[PDB]
Amino acid sequence: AQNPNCNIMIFHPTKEEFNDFDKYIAYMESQGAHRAGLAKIIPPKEWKARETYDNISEILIATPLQQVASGRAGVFTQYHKKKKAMTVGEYRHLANSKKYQTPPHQNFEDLERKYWKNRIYNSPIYGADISGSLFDENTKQWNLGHLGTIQDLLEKECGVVIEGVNTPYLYFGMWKTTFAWHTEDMDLYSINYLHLGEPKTWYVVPPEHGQRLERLARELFPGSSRGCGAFLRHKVALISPTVLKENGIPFNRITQEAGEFMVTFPYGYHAGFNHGFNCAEAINFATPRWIDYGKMASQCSCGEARVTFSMDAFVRILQPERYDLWKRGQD
Template identity: 55%
Template sequence: MEDIFENSKSNPRIMTFYPTYEQFKNFSKFITYIESKGAHLAGLAKVVPPREWVPRKSGYDIDHINMLIPNPILQLVSGKQGQYQVINMQKRSMTLKDFKAEAESQKYRTPVHFDHDELERKYWKNIAYVSPLYAADVKGSLSDSDLDVWNISRLGTILDFVNTDYGIEIEGVNTAYLYFGMWKSSFAWHTEDMDLYSINYLHFGEPKTWYAIPPAYGKRFEKVAAQMFKEHYDDCNAHLRHKMTMISPKVLSHYNIPVNKITQMAGEIMITFPFGYHAGFNHGYNGAESTNFASPRWIEYGKRARICHCNRDTVKISMETFVRRFQAERYENWLNGVDYGYHPEDPGNICRAPPPTLNVYEYKSSESSGDYKQSRKRKAFQKVNLQNNTNVSLAEFSKEAIVRVRKLSYNPVNTVDYNAIFNDQIERLWNQLPSETVGRNLLTNGIIKNTNRMRFHTKTIILSDDE
């Protein structure tokens, strides 16, 4: 196996791996291997798969891919000087063929450039102009169903316990999602849900530029982002979970936060690691497939992951099955809220791991106990109090989870002032609408705050406070 990397303790670099097919076949074993080489220290790694691995034998002829994109998004960017917020505006559904035509149109096509560095400069210079479309989070897979090696739909990692133990499928987390991009469509700075690993395979098309912050600098990055966008963090201390924040590497360098960069070509795989903040953009029309996965090393990250409580789509996975299986010596303390330790990337801060908050358990008497014949239910809330039943020992009961994953309650928070932020974007959209005559602006005082739907001619623009 040929590995290309340059690493140091202060600023680990992104590694690239060229495995043979034999080395490539066992996914979990391969992840363990690249971590033994220090790949996780950069938060991101590239894998160039062996030639024998062909995930889709029929190729990518657009005429043979009958796919509907139900919710393409228009990415509106506001900000300046390398600090931006991205709002995703939902558009009407379109076919993949229509999306490709849009991506290659004069309006959206990739500008002429000499190399990837020049294209990157054009990206940051024009990030707030000509809002691109992005077909993100599309359910499905482009891989052959009989693909047994590195099939993104079934990687066979410990994250499968969410499904086998709980009977839960979380779209895009333990199932595959597709992403179709065009020039300048972006993915904002974020870590994965519950700080999981992720895999991204670029099936076809133009490259992606990836930025990655080493996990050891993740806490510092969070503090810097909170300072830059204080008004958003006042509403949600996990604002980066909203996937709205774009900060240029040049700006982050002023705060002594190292940012590594790498280009992903078609046919290459990117692996992100727990608590590895990453962002990037597409060079043009392309298609990628992605999902999350886990390893035992992730569990402590998952227990201490910061959760957004204001977004109704927040993913929260119960850690009960993972702690019980892989941290048995800490299980009782964790249930009781006294599992003291530290976040793997914040070793100087000793604190307790949050106990389970979403599970509903059913305790049944075991064969060794004759005192309790009836099953009973107990909710494991923020403060688990197993001492309420003084005559009952937890060891006397086997436990079966009834409800393991539940959407967090959603309390809408009005964080976006459309008057202040989107006036220029709407004006641009207005000017781009086809019309035989010049329209008259009826919104002389700016955009009506909290507007949910506005019609200009025959086109609909949806501005939703819920996003």
């Protein structure tokens, strides 16, 4: 078995290997990459996402989210308070202000220490989940707006044609902006490209050990667990590496820098934080190997998770027994 310790693997495809996206994902899996839940892909030196980032300031962040924490430093939830709209230029200025800017630090490890010590005492503002793309239309390789759609994959594998669409999302971050522990909708893959700015630190639990994280989460968030049998789908709970280690949960960590891709694999729980002002683009995707994960994915039916239009068909076709309860949660 390849990669039996479930380490995060880093790949350096050549320009020729960067042509065929599906083929390269299957290659990475042949080397055991998926066992970690997360892989890094460094593009060939010849590649670029677009020519420059000099003209992005007028993008609108219609609903910036202030991420307010509750709990203790290593075990907390966050809720998202909606703020007034602002442009990317306005948000960048805000991220760089004395109130929000990255503190002085020695290296990524020192910054990570500072994050976990101090995150809860601040409420950073995240421009998350903005439909759109920063890839140039002429970028033919690993262009996250030109991937094969999940609806087409389901139709290719299973023969059933379904409604729905699959488009990317932009994320504008600042210091301490946080992504809570989660797997993707329907335990899909994700791919995330860090277009510009400061790094993003990731934590990940191997898919084969995801239920260990779920059992810890139920212990640490016991009211939430009584409320919903899949409350990590709410995407609000944080648990620090120190607490994971104290409880014997297998995990790994890595820092993504600008110009790098990360892929999360089906049922790979992940969480993390941004180091300073940045912009990422991410989208969900599927492969043949996903289908079995999609059929077994947990679902939130309590009403909290509320998701896209296109998840309806995935539940309806892959999980018909669960469909009626899940759809009630959507309505």
